[PDB]
Design a protein around this ligand. Structure first.
Ligand SMILES: [K+]
Ligand SMILES: [Mg+2]
Ligand SMILES: [Mg+2]
Ligand SMILES: [Mg+2]
Ligand SMILES: [Mg+2]
Ligand SMILES: [Mg+2]
Ligand SMILES: [Mg+2]
Ligand SMILES: [Mg+2]
Ligand SMILES: [Mg+2]
Ligand SMILES: [Mg+2]
Ligand SMILES: [Mg+2]
Ligand SMILES: [Mg+2]
Ligand SMILES: [Mg+2]
Ligand SMILES: [Mg+2]
Ligand SMILES: [Mg+2]
Ligand SMILES: [Mg+2]
Ligand SMILES: [Mg+2]
Ligand SMILES: [Mg+2]
Ligand SMILES: [Mg+2]
Ligand SMILES: [Mg+2]
Ligand SMILES: [Mg+2]
Ligand SMILES: [Mg+2]
Ligand SMILES: [Mg+2]
Ligand SMILES: [Mg+2]
Ligand SMILES: [Mg+2]
Ligand SMILES: [Mg+2]
Ligand SMILES: [Mg+2]
Ligand SMILES: [Mg+2]
Ligand SMILES: [Mg+2]
Ligand SMILES: [Mg+2]
Ligand SMILES: [Mg+2]
Ligand SMILES: [Mg+2]
Ligand SMILES: [Mg+2]
Ligand SMILES: [Mg+2]
Ligand SMILES: [Mg+2]
Ligand SMILES: [Mg+2]
Lengths: 133, 56, 73
RNA sequence: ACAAGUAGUUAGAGCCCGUUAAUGGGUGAUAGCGUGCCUUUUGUAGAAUGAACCGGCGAGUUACGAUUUGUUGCAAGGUUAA
RNA sequence: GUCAUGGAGGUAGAGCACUGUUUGGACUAGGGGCCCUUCUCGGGUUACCGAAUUCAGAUAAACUCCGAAUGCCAUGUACUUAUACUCGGGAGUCAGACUGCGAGUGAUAAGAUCCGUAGUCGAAAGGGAAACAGCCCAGACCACCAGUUAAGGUCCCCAAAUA
RNA sequence: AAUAGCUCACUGGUCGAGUGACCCCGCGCCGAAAAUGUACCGGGGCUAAACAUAUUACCGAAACUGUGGAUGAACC
RNA sequence: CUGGGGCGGUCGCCUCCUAAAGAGUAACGGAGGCGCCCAAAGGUUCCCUCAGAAUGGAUGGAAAUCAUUCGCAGAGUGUAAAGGCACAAGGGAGCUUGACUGCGAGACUGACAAGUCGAGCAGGGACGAAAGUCGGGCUUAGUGAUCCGGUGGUUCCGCAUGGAAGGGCCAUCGCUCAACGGAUAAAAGCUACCCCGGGGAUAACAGGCUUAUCUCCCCCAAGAGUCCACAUCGACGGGGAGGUUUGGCACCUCGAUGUCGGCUCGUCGCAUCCUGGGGCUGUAGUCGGUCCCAAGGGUUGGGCUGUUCGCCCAUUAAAGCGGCAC
RNA sequence: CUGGUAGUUAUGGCGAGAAGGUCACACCCGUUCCCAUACCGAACACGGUAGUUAAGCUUCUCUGCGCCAAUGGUAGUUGGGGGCUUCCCCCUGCGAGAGUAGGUCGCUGCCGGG
């Protein structure tokens, strides 16, 4: 998951204060994985969690990724002093605020959904809760 | 008519609070001032309620 | 490759609503008409709004989305 | 001569004295508190600087101009220089 | 300084009306796969792409249909308070520090760096935090073998509850 | 080896009161290894002398007050 | 200037974000522009409305021009961006030169130098029937002082007098002075042969903070392991501890904290190399593996490399890994 | 009653439906004259009033679109305090945006004709 293009190549880290303004109620699937505390979810973590959910379902039922990594983040290499302008873009993150349903799934029984989502949750740097519609 | 007593120090407090306490006519800690109960005075007291104590 | 920026142009209101101003007092500095000339007010060549006569400054609404500054003696 | 000490200070027995005689002097068991001085620093007990100790010597002055304050004399005048 | 009244201003939040980023349907265009009486001119399929289109749902320092709290500028015939301005004589300062809050840079590291804003230190002794410039409490004119309180405390070191 | 054999589920009997799931909150547990010496409460030590909620006494500063003294400014 | 210095980059001006809803506000923070252009792209009068899409039409094609309907701007605005603009500031046409001379109450902005806006007055005009508008351009960049020269003008001065020379005043022109408040009219390097004044304001060593990186330990479990996730391993991801690495920072020390390796002497940690005890095992046995407990003692002679390290020879129960100013 | 002309953040607008007409208003007929078209009497201008409410215009109904919009709650937040500090919580005041109940097919002034 990467933005096809971006207005600006570099961008503020921002902050993660408050409950997510939207996407706090499961809207597509039966079951959803709700963030309980805030964190940056990198695209590498979203892919890890997606494959983990999907493999366990065996091409059965649907998986909605409700978060997208819109925000680039930069880094400085090792052995580079501070200054000389902002570092090069490294990757892509989605700042997930608390209460944000990150994944949703439908078309499998509760037990498989609940199992799929715990496998997904173990790849994410955030405390999760499984919630249903 | 209110009796206002400065019960906390102004050391460590922002200018606005010090300036309000001054305009109320309070000096040293435990200074006391008697004022006619107005909306204007009541408004000053609200700004520094954490610094003073108010009687009747 | 960045590092540049112009001097700030100290735009915005220079006299308050309800304030007596002399003729020629700049009321508002602006690019374009954020605010429009009212009665006894003129728009300078750089959109500066100024009092044509002495009087009291009044910022009014002039129709839903627009705004104007007048000077009433 | 069972003690952990920037050396004093506050509290204080005991012992010895007796003054410019006054809620005095010497010493100080024991108890509390306590990180020299200077320089330079955001910050120095500083493991930054300087001084072994004592004594002497050792750093905003004078001239001529400018300006301002104060004082005094005279005042639409005041004042002489060589 | 506060109250009242007026006003400028687009931040927080929020929102998707615009601009960008984006998920899943549905919907037709088409082109490309797929078979093809065909000159791939035209059909029949597609889920391989697709640019619109709507429905639902997200997202923003350099988006805004919206929009606070504060702060700011004024006014008053309001209540408090005691400075303000002008002109002269004399300066010093132009290495700042940390803490809280709001930002950037950094890795949402630094006792980092750079602004904003408040405080303390600097130039502030006292009490607390074992010790501890920058934290908490609080400002030392001098004396007293008087009293009350702050933070912090009250079994012993160690003042106060074995409340 | 396949069979045989032992066992459960699932029932009557005895016995004579409770027993079995799930969710939420408080406080705890593991996860927890560094170099001179205990050494991640200052110490002693504490099962409260810890924590929570509520209460009230006291201690506690060069704060404020008392008493005496010195001193700057302003106004009578 | 500079998160030491050098190298690279930058140096003045304009727009935005950073900027915390007045103004202002830093960084070798994030993005772009400028060093002009225009005789109309200026003034004024009058008149007007754009983009795009649908539909139908010869050359004509997705897209030229024409017609209709729907179209608040999805166009345009010389030129970045922001703020504006459909009573248009956008588009036509007619006449024009106000892209005027003298000024200017009063404001804004500013340390100063400068910069910005300005009603209104007079002269004489342009357009307009008049009202009126017009001292350039929708607004905000497009610039550079003084000194010295050049040209033009002048009821100014003219060193006894008349002139003149020369100066003054008004107008205007000549340097990338761009390091853009411009040291001069005129300016590059090496120093390990160096020297003085200073600085822990500032680097190299060691310490400190930090822990991205590093080492170690874990979570999840897709896989591997003859079947078999978890004997032994473990991708994609996730969470810690440590403070031995590579780094970041510049807080102590520049009136000296004076050095890598080796030698001598050790001491400490345990994340254990050997020896001791145990659990599991893909533990038949032997020989092993792995984890738990365990720091008492032990833990090598050589060759090559300055070498830490490494490679090799030959041993050993073993040839542990770290800390202590490496 | 209708023509003109103002004011008022669209509660005023748009869209849909209906009715009305020498009392104006309008379209409508003409290009001789003034005056027009970067071509066109379409427009602009001028002269007519045979014809008609079809359209604009005026009045009436409608909530489909827009627009306006409480209360309550929430977000945020000044000040004051706490934490387990990517942040979070408590007290006091202020208090959105969204959403909702609901409101709206305008209101108001002058002048002429009726
Ligand atoms: K997780
Ligand atoms: Mg405080
Ligand atoms: Mg700036
Ligand atoms: Mg101009
Ligand atoms: Mg002893
Ligand atoms: Mg003894
Ligand atoms: Mg020493
Ligand atoms: Mg010495
Ligand atoms: Mg003098
Ligand atoms: Mg926001
Ligand atoms: Mg914003
Ligand atoms: Mg610092
Ligand atoms: Mg600060
Ligand atoms: Mg100093
Ligand atoms: Mg102190
Ligand atoms: Mg102490
Ligand atoms: Mg000190
Ligand atoms: Mg007491
Ligand atoms: Mg006691
Ligand atoms: Mg005192
Ligand atoms: Mg450098
Ligand atoms: Mg550095
Ligand atoms: Mg601002
Ligand atoms: Mg002559
Ligand atoms: Mg310069
Ligand atoms: Mg040589
Ligand atoms: Mg030297
Ligand atoms: Mg230093
Ligand atoms: Mg420096
Ligand atoms: Mg170092
Ligand atoms: Mg050291
Ligand atoms: Mg620094
Ligand atoms: Mg020395
Ligand atoms: Mg062990
Ligand atoms: Mg060797
Ligand atoms: Mg060494």
């Amino acid at each position: 998951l990467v933005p096809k293009r971006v207005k600006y190549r570099r961008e503020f880290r921002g902050n993660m204060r408050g409950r997510a303004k939207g996407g706090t109620e499961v809207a597509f699937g039966e079951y959803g994985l709700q963030a309980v505390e805030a964190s940056w979810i990198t695209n590498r973590q979203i892919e890890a969690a997606r494959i983990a959910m999907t493999r366990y379902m065996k091409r059965g039922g649907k998986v909605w990724i409700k978060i997208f990594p819109h925000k680039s983040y930069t880094s400085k290499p090792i052995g580079v002093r501070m200054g000389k302008g902002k570092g090069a873009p490294e990757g892509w993150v989605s700042p997930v605020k608390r209460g944000k349903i990150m994944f949703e799934i439908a078309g499998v029984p509760e037990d498989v959904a609940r199992e799929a989502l715990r496998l997904a949750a173990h790849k994410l740097p955030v405390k999760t809760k499984i919630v249903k519609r | 008519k209110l009796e206002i007593t400065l019960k906390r120090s102004l050391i460590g407090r922002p200018q606005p609070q010090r300036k309000t306490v001054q305009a109320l006519g309070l000096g040293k800690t435990n200074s006391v001032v008697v004022k006619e109960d107005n909306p204007a005075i009541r408004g000053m007291i609200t700004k520094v309620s954490h610094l003073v104590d108010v009687k009747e | 490759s960045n590092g540049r920026d112009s001097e700030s142009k100290r735009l915005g209101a220079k006299r308050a609503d309800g304030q007596f101003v002399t003729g020629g007092s700049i009321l508002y500095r602006q690019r374009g008409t954020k605010i429009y000339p009212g009665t006894n007010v003129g728009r300078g060549g750089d959109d500066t709004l100024f009092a044509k006569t002495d009087g009291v400054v009044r910022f009014e609404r002039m129709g839903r989305d627009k705004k104007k500054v007048s000077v009433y003696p």
